[PDB]
Design a protein around this ligand. Structure first.
Ligand SMILES: Nc1ncnc2c1ncn2[C@@H]1O[C@H](COP(=O)(O)OP(=O)(O)OP(O)(O)=S)[C@@H](O)[C@H]1O
Ligand SMILES: Nc1ncnc2c1ncn2[C@@H]1O[C@H](COP(=O)(O)OP(=O)(O)OP(O)(O)=S)[C@@H](O)[C@H]1O
Ligand SMILES: Nc1ncnc2c1ncn2[C@@H]1O[C@H](COP(=O)(O)OP(=O)(O)OP(O)(O)=S)[C@@H](O)[C@H]1O
Ligand SMILES: [Mg+2]
Ligand SMILES: [Mg+2]
Ligand SMILES: [Mg+2]
Lengths: 318, 492, 330, 258, 257
DNA sequence: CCCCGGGGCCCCCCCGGC
DNA sequence: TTTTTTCGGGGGGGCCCCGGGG
């Protein structure tokens, strides 16, 4: 079949700021800016799939109305954003003459700005300062640290947080009512639990479950979305008896096709974020995990190495 | 044409006069005095230093943290004295070729716009090279060209940067008059903040201003931006929202090496409650703020603390030994990372082995001042001496039977008794004999001097050589220069 | 390239249609359902080597486009340059342009995407998002830790399990029918045991076993043939070595190990691995025994991986097992 | 020098033919048979299809016993062809089960022989039938004018939109610095029947194409004085340059309208 | 398309004018009044000033209802102008308070029209009033001779010194690799009045100039066959190229003594 | 026959985890 | 209160030289 069904993440992409769930204070501030005007230079940072690009695009659209095509310059990682681009194309756009309503300005949307080089960011400083009377800059990124401090000083920082389960449930129920999707409470709970606050992941998983099995229940959802292996690793590391940990390693991870490198990296991350355990014990476990990781990187990616790592961790925890 | 209500406050309330700039009054006055006496220094060829000592520098270098007002201060001092400004920034191309083409021709050229506009100094150029820190590159980046121009220029030159303590700024070590801009005090900025709040018609508590200034870390521009964004919706900045505003606008600033070392070696963060507040992820991120120097600082400063995390029955020396062992393991991991395999995925592990774990084993209160790593200079000195040893060894290859290490450990102590001791004992009469030995091994006077520096401990030749009468050394030099000598490596 | 019979069995038996992919019924059924109703999302196939990921995606491409799929899909792998410039130009042009031949959607297959740099993966995000209406992406991977979270968020994940026993048996039966070969039940059991869920190993070992027979038309492949061609220890050898280690003195154990190894030139690594597998089923009273066994045997394996003295390593294995089991008494 | 022997009386014609599409594709399969040579290639981005045909009337002599497929890298072939003078005949030679192709430049007047060998490559490409389609609009115009228009419009945007309406052909480009639009109308001059613009329209069309691909395509103007453009909605655009015996065709897919 | 309509009979003239000084300045303000077009620009180094005047007589047609200003990036303008044929009539079209200008290339022998739109730039610069100054020395020489002299002396030194004295013009380019000296003697030829070197000399002058600015200036040699040079003791040197109805002037600030 | 535009190498400079 | 090692990738400056126009 040569036909394609439009993904719901695109079919139901919010078109106004009112349709964005979560981060109520930030969305309210953006709505106030849009209604009033005089948008300042801004940087929006957050985790994947929470509504940063959506928020920026909605703000630009509602601010510029019919002048969106002429007054918005969008550049992302898929485009060229080198020093030459910043020095010529962005500067030309900033210097461009364009009559706008009394309190509107041209907008440069640098999406995924954390991937820009230091030279381009340095070049942007004087362009931002000189033409602030007609152009304003909006950055969207996952890691705000990558933005050089001089740019951060000129921008307003609007940090986004993970969406709560309530907002995810609300959006999922809205989409279900729109699409007439048969569902059960356990299915939605499983979808939300596996999404981990990522709206895009939740919507994609729901659509995949509906396409593959129709009924959105726990069984079908788990048949589509696998159990997060980080939780399996956390269970493995916190097991009381070494036999239980070895059984988990052999049955839930090794026989499921997970590579040793993935297992060791996940173990390192989970041990790092294991606040329940004392810091010194975590440091010892991290040392052992690093030894095993180096051994695996040298090419000995066997199950015996992982079993030995588990045994050493068990000895440490005793 | 542009309505004043559509302008950013940082533009609306920009300092229009040198007396309107808050803070760093001393540096501003120093820059004003230096630029006002540039002609007087020129008449003296920049030789007679003045009362302030700013008479031997033909170019000023303003540096400080972001947002203090360096650019505005430089521009205002330029205009007040009547000069014409030729400003460049990272938005322009400033490579070797472009620098040699555009700005090189303006360092001694009259200003046509200055001629047409018309003070006695309105036809001259004050070149302001802003954002020199952004001049990415080495020899071709133009940084070296600007350093050279700071040594040769017929008109005043001003360079503005942020991090002067950067390797790329080394060519400017001593070429310019340094001028520091520091985090302005809260009192200086409070008047302007109150004025802006009054004009913008929103409630600002005078006490809250101090917390706001602390949040931005002395960044006036960021303070005004925060004020604008807060007043957008919340026009009542009371004491019930100080924490929320401060936490929403806390700039994420990468700590500097000394600050990283001080924070990592503090014993509070390694306590149960301190660890709960400052987590292990936070410590790893602190390492990642500067992963090239953090391990070096930890290694340098992990023996100069009073620990507060010692275990019952553990002494300071045992904790130090454990930290040293983990530092060695971290060094091995680092060797693994920077190899042909490029195993950068082990970088987090290194963070734990090189910095976090040893620091946690000796964390406490600093017993002194945080010192910069001494390994870099020692490594450079070792490389220099190894190059000298290689040169000496390959000069004497035809006569000896050994490797360079064998030459250092065995041959040189005996060479000393035939090269230096006879001068100390016989005096001038030891000249010819010494040269004879120098001829048998293709040794040059430079080789003699280099050899005389390798010795350590009880056989250091510095004072001994310095004590030789000048007549003997002069005779040695003259006799060496007045005769033909053999050559070993006759490259053609 | 004369005929299909001049190809190695791994390539000669590559599945051509989804119906020939075995051991992945869940994934195959789900993807077939997606394709039938035109509801194909962006796909990620994560799995260990030789499970059928590339075969499955190529078969899906054939199912969608037909015999001329090669000119209707954009396939890139580790052997090709996939830098940021390639993503910006070639992938972007393919994703934003109509098909030359048909009027259907466009498929991009980034095989071995875990070898792609972070910059290219980041550049791919907006390409994937912007052209979803007419383009779909398929990513294939063995190591998920090399994939950026942003890319993972945009794809629906399917895990290819290690091939179950039954799929391997059925594929072996097909191969035996095609090649006119006889396989004994014990030989099949040993082949499945040594495969570890990888079809390529099964096919290579079977081809070697066929080459090892004097008269393949009538001669049958037995477990002895499998062990000889693969040069692997027999279960009896492992059991005898373990019994000698656990029940005899040092001299007898050393002599038994040396004799067993020298009889067929076995490798110490294979003996260690087989003994570890056997010991994994032992019910041990004390956990310290298992801890010491695992740690010491892992150390010996790591040392062997770098070379060293074989005799010292074998004596180390014997001593480690003896010392570890000394703790079971009390 | 037994199976395939094909002599170009002028060695420059083959060089021009190769140069017409060497920047579009790299690996090309040449199928030589009794009635001449054919070739089909697809660009790496799979957006452009190049189809070349040369009949036996284009050779001074031509002999092929059985069909032969020669896989070549066009860069190496262009390098070899650049080593031949314009006054030398060029013979292509191939044998049974060939691993190489021989290019022989002969200058009888100077009695100069220059023989080169190019190793063949195994390309698994099956000639895909370019099924004929009843296009909505078909026009023909001098190649030089089309090249000039394409080059001028490529300076403004990376996409060029062609609109065919009753008695009008419009090329439009929109970019960061500005926009441009060139409008032409069918015009016939009996005095000089080489500058004429001919159009036959059945349904108006509007299609956008990448500028880089058009820039690559216009490089075939050195082969013919005229270019024929066939456009139809829901089908690739065909750009044909006619040779003495054969032709060079470019099938370019339009950009998705979304 | 009502406010400003300026029809050049030949599109080549405007392209030549732009190419004359597009390599010295980048963003230029063209003010169109009821008399013609005036443009003033200053290079990045603020050392060279470019003045351009085109009168109403230089157009096939000209109609400007109200005075207008247009800020243009010369790079984009040249890019557009290269799209016109030699035998094409050019039309610059603008409306009230324009955000863009329309360049129309029209052909009469062939019924083909090419319309381009150029986006205008917002340029904030101060118009310097260049009052007339009685220069000490006036010189008129063929453009080719001056261009050759400048290009010959440029590669020797980054700076060129012109000394005008009684019946003598000396160009010296002493540098690092070597030195160069070229002496021109005023003379008049009736057979070829377009080759004469004319010098009106009042006070001796010795001025040093940057070589790159002379290299940029010589690019205007195409516009005018003969270039004029007006020099003073310290005032900027004026290099003028005449145009059928108008002129292109370069004011260059001399190097300080 | 000579000058100018623009493709292609060549050389050097900086990053690298979550 | 100052300043190091290696592949591979990516970027950016610098020529070089073929081609095409005049
Ligand atoms: N707050 C939200 N409300 C409604 N839909 C959302 C929200 N966030 C994400 N989505 C949905 O998921 C899709 C993707 O959202 P995005 O805005 O692209 O997330 P993102 O923050 O830009 O992810 P990254 O950082 O670029 S990987 C949207 O089209 C929406 O359909
Ligand atoms: N000392 C100051 N007094 C008053 N306003 C200041 C001061 N410093 C900064 N500002 C405000 O912030 C704006 C920018 O000041 P700048 O002169 O650009 O500081 P800066 O140190 O040069 O910033 P960098 O180093 O280029 S990031 C000014 O227009 C003022 O509105
Ligand atoms: N499910 C399967 N069914 C039948 N044969 C298989 C299957 N999986 C692998 N094979 C066989 O092994 C060969 C390789 O299969 P592939 O599809 O290439 O596995 P793969 O997972 O893509 O390998 P990687 O990830 O590149 S190491 C096939 O040609 C088949 O002969
Ligand atoms: Mg996004
Ligand atoms: Mg500044
Ligand atoms: Mg594969």
């Amino acid at each position: 079949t040569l036909s394609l069904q439009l993904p719901w993440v695109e079919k139901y992409r919010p078109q106004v700021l009112s349709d964005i769930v979560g981060n109520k204070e930030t969305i309210d501030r953006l709505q106030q800016i849009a209604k009033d005007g005089n948008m300042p230079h801004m940087i929006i940072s957050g985790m994947p799939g929470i509504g940063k690009t959506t928020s920026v695009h909605c703000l630009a659209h509602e601010l510029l109305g019919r002048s969106y095509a002429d007054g918005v310059l969008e550049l992302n990682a898929s485009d060229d954003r080198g020093i030459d681009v910043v020095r010529n194309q962005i500067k030309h756009f900033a210097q461009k003459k364009l009559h706008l309503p009394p309190g509107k300005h041209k907008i440069v949307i640098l999406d995924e700005a954390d991937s820009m080089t230091a030279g381009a960011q340095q070049a942007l400083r004087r362009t931002m300062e000189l033409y602030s009377n007609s152009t304003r800059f909006a950055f969207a990124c996952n890691q705000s640290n990558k933005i050089i401090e001089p740019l951060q000083s000129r921008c307003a920082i609007l940090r986004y947080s993970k969406l709560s389960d309530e907002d995810v449930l609300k959006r999922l129920l809205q989409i279900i009512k729109l699409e007439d999707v048969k569902y059960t409470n356990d299915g939605l709970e499983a979808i939300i639990f596996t999404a981990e606050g990522d709206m895009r992941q939740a919507i994609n998983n729901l659509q995949s479950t509906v396409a593959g099995h129709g009924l959105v229940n726990a069984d079908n959802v788990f048949k589509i979305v696998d159990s997060p292996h980080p939780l399996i690793v956390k269970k493995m590391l916190l097991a009381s008896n070494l036999e239980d940990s070895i059984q988990i390693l052999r049955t839930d991870l090794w026989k499921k096709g997970y590579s040793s490198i993935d297992i060791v990296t996940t173990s390192f991350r989970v041990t790092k974020n294991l606040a329940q355990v004392k810091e010194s014990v975590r440091l010892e476990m991290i040392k052992e995990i690093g030894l095993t990781h180096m051994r695996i990187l040298e090419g000995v990616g066997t199950y015996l190495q992982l079993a030995s790592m588990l045994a050493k961790i068990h000895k440490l925890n005793n | 044409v542009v309505r004043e209500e559509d302008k950013l406050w940082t533009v609306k309330y920009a300092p229009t006069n040198l007396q309107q700039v808050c803070g760093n009054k001393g540096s501003v006055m120093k820059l004003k005095n230096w630029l006002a006496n540039w002609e007087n220094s020129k008449k003296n060829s920049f030789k007679h230093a003045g009362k302030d000592g700013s008479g031997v520098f033909r170019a000023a270098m303003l540096y400080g943290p972001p947002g203090i007002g360096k650019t505005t201060a430089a521009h205002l001092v330029a205009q007040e004295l009547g000069y014409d400004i030729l400003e460049q920034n990272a938005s322009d191309v400033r490579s070797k070729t472009l620098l040699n083409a555009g700005v090189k021709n303006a360092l001694d050229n009259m200003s046509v716009v200055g001629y047409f506009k018309h003070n006695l100094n309105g036809k001259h150029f004050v070149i302001i090279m802003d954002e020199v820190d952004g001049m990415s590159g080495g020899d071709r980046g133009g940084v070296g060209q600007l350093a050279q121009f700071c040594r040769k220029t017929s008109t005043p030159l001003i360079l503005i940067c942020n991090e002067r303590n950067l390797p790329k700024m080394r060519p400017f070590d001593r070429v310019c008059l340094d001028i520091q801009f520091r985090r302005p005090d809260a009192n200086s900025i409070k008047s302007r903040l109150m004025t802006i709040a009054i004009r913008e018609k929103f409630k600002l508590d005078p006490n809250v201003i101090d917390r706001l200034i602390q949040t931005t870390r002395g960044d006036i521009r960021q303070v005004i931006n925060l004020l604008s964004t807060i007043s957008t919706t919340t026009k009542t900045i009371n004491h019930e929202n100080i924490n929320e505003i401060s936490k929403a606008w806390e700039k994420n600033i990468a700590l500097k090496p000394f600050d990283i070392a001080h924070k990592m070696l503090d014993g509070q963060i390694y306590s149960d409650i301190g660890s709960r507040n400052f987590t292990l992820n936070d410590k790893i991120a602190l390492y990642f703020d500067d992963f090239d120097f953090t391990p070096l600082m930890i290694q340098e400063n992990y023996l100069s603390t009073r620990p507060s995390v010692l275990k019952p029955g553990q002494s300071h020396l045992e904790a130090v030994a454990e930290a040293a062992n983990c530092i060695s393991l971290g060094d091995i991991v680092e060797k693994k990372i920077r190899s042909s395999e490029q195993l950068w995925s082990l970088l987090p592990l290194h963070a734990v082995l090189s910095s976090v774990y040893p620091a946690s084993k000796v964390a406490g209160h600093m017993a002194g001042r945080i010192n910069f790593t001494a390994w870099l200079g020692q490594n450079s000195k070792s490389a220099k001496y190894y190059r000298l040893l290689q040169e000496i060894h390959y000069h004497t290859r035809l006569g000896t039977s050994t490797d360079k290490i064998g030459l250092r450990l065995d041959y040189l102590p005996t060479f000393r008794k035939r090269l230096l001791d006879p001068f100390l004992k016989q005096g001038a009469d030891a000249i010819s004999s010494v040269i004879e030995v120098m001829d048998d091994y293709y040794l040059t006077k430079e080789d003699w001097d280099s050899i005389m520096e390798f010795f350590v401990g009880p056989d250091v030749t510095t004072a001994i050589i310095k004590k030789i009468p000048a007549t003997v050394k002069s005779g040695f030099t003259r006799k060496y220069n007045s005769m033909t000598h053999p050559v070993a490596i006759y490259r053609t | 390239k004369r005929s299909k019979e001049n190809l190695p069995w791994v390539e000669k038996y590559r599945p051509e249609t989804l119906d020939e992919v075995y051991g992945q019924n869940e994934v195959i059924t789900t993807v077939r359902k997606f394709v039938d109703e035109g509801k194909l999302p962006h796909l990620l196939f994560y799995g260990p080597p030789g499970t059928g990921k590339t075969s499955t995606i190529v078969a899906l491409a054939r199912e969608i486009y037909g015999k001329n799929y090669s000119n209707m899909v954009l396939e890139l792998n580790a052997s090709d340059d996939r830098g940021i410039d390639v993503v910006r130009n070639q992938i972007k042009d393919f994703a934003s342009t109509r098909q030359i031949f048909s009027k259907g959607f466009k498929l991009i297959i980034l095989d071995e995407a875990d070898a792609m740099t972070n910059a290219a993966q980041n550049a791919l995000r907006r390409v994937i998002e912007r052209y979803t209406k007419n383009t779909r992406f398929c990513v294939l991977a063995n190591y998920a830790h090399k994939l950026t979270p942003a890319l993972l968020s945009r794809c629906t994940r399917f895990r290819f399990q290690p091939l179950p026993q039954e799929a391997i048996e059925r594929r072996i039966a097909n191969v035996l029918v095609h090649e006119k070969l006889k396989l004994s039940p014990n030989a099949e059991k040993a082949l499945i045991e040594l495969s570890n869920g990888d079809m390529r190993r099964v096919l290579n070992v079977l081809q070697s076993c066929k080459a090892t027979l004097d008269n393949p038309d009538e001669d049958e492949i037995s477990d002895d043939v499998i062990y000889e061609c693969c040069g692997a220890p027999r279960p009896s050898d492992l059991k005898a070595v373990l019994k000698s280690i656990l029940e005899d003195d040092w001299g007898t154990a050393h002599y038994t190990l040396n004799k067993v190894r020298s009889a067929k030139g076995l490798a110490l690594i294979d003996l260690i691995e087989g003994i570890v597998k056997i010991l994994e089923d032992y019910e041990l009273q004390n956990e310290e025994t298992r801890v010491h066994l695992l740690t010491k045997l892992a150390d010996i394996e790591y040392s062997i991986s770098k070379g060293g003295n074989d005799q010292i390593q074998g004596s180390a294995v014997i001593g480690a097992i003896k010392a570890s089991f000394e703790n079971e008494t009390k | 020098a037994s199976m395939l022997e094909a002599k170009f009386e002028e060695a420059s014609l083959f060089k021009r033919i190769i140069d017409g599409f060497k920047d579009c594709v790299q690996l090309v399969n040449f199928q030589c048979k009794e009635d001449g040579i054919i070739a089909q290639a697809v660009d790496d981005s799979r957006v452009l299809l190049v189809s070349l045909e040369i009949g036996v009337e284009a050779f001074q002599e031509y002999r092929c016993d059985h069909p032969v497929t020669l896989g070549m890298d066009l860069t190496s072939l262009s390098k070899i062809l650049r080593c031949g003078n314009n006054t030398d005949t060029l013979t292509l030679i191939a044998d049974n089960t060939p691993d190489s192709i021989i290019l022989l430049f002969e200058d009888t007047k100077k009695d100069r022989i220059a023989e080169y060998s190019l190793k063949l490559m195994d390309i698994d490409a099956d000639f895909l039938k370019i099924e004929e389609l009843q296009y909505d609009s078909t026009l023909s115009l001098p190649s030089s004018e089309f090249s000039k228009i394409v080059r001028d419009l490529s300076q403004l945007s990376d996409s060029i939109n062609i609109m065919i309406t009753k008695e009008t052909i419009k090329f439009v480009a929109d970019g960061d610095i500005g926009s441009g639009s060139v409008i032409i109308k069918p015009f016939v001059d009996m005095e000089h029947p080489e500058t004429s613009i001919k159009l036959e329209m059945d349904q108006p069309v509007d299609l956008t194409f990448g500028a880089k691909y058009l820039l690559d395509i216009i490089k075939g103007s050195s082969l013919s004085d005229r270019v024929g453009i066939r456009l139809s909605s829901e089908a690739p655009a065909l750009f044909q340059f006619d040779l003495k015996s054969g032709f060079l065709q470019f099938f370019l897919a339009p950009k998705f309208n979304d």
